[PDB]
Amino acid sequence: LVPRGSHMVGLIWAQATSGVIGRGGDIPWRLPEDQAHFREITMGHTIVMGRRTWDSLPAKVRPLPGRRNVVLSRQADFMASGAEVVGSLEEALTSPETWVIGGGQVYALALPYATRCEVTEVDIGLPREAGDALAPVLDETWRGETGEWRFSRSGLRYRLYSYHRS
Ligand SMILES: NC(=O)c1ccc[n+]([C@@H]2O[C@H](COP(=O)([O-])OP(=O)(O)OC[C@H]3O[C@@H](n4cnc5c(N)ncnc54)[C@H](OP(=O)(O)O)[C@@H]3O)[C@@H](O)[C@H]2O)c1
Numbered sequence: 001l002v003p004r005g006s007h008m009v010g011l012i013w014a015q016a017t018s019g020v021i022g023r024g025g026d027i028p029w030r031l032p033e034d035q036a037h038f039r040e041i042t043m044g045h046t047i048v049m050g051r052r053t054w055d056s057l058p059a060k061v062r063p064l065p066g067r068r069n070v071v072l073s074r075q076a077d078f079m080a081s082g083a084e085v086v087g088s089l090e091e092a093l094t095s096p097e098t099w100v101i102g103g104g105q106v107y108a109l110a111l112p113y114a115t116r117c118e119v120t121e122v123d124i125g126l127p128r129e130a131g132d133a134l135a136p137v138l139d140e141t142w143r144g145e146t147g148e149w150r151f152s153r154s155g156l157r158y159r160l161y162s163y164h165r166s
């Protein structure tokens, strides 16, 4: 029951405790439970990603189903079969609800407009290295709930944070 007419911009990411979210063009862990959670949050909404995050999805899974896929690139002729390609965030955020799904550069671009963050914290020890993609560091305007730790089937421990701001 949200009145029509507004544009909710959310960020969603999964990070190691160190803040690492990406390395070698991939996510350096596998957490099917987090993929299910990611699908549930974003389903039915527009999803915006950087060109490198588009490249990081296997060809056989993209575009992600049930969502309008939007890819941010400076290459006007970039080929993202089944997605919209835009050259700035100006016209990427026009839906009633948009989820920015990564990666490092696009989170920083969209953070100023975001009022929700859905964060998965993965208890993996990965100290930051040169070239890693990192999560945004939220400031004090954000408030939210910290979920309980839970074990994935692989035995990796993780928890969900749901943050909001006005
Ligand atoms: N939750 C997670 O853990 C998570 C989620 C998503 C992604 N990732 C990972 O994060 C890493 C990718 O993140 P990243 O920071 O390296 O790249 P990215 O943010 O996904 O995409 C970067 C690209 O976006 C375009 N871009 C950036 N700023 C732009 C601007 N102002 N205007 C127009 N286009 C702009 C450029 O594309 P062009 O070069 O084509 O011009 C830039 O190369 C990968 O390792 C991925 O696996 C992790």
Ligand SMILES: CCc1nc(N)nc(N)c1OCCCOc1ccccc1C[C@H](C)C(=O)O
Pocket: 012, 013, 014, 026, 027, 034, 035, 037, 038, 039, 053, 056, 057, 058, 061, 064, 100, 101, 102, 118, 119, 120
């Ligand atoms: C589930 C990862 C994730 N998790 C969270 N919490 N936030 C995010 N932005 C986020 O990234 C979504 C974009 C990258 O997707 C992936 C990368 C590497 C392996 C597996 C997937 C999942 C597949 C491709 C799928 O969803 O179909």
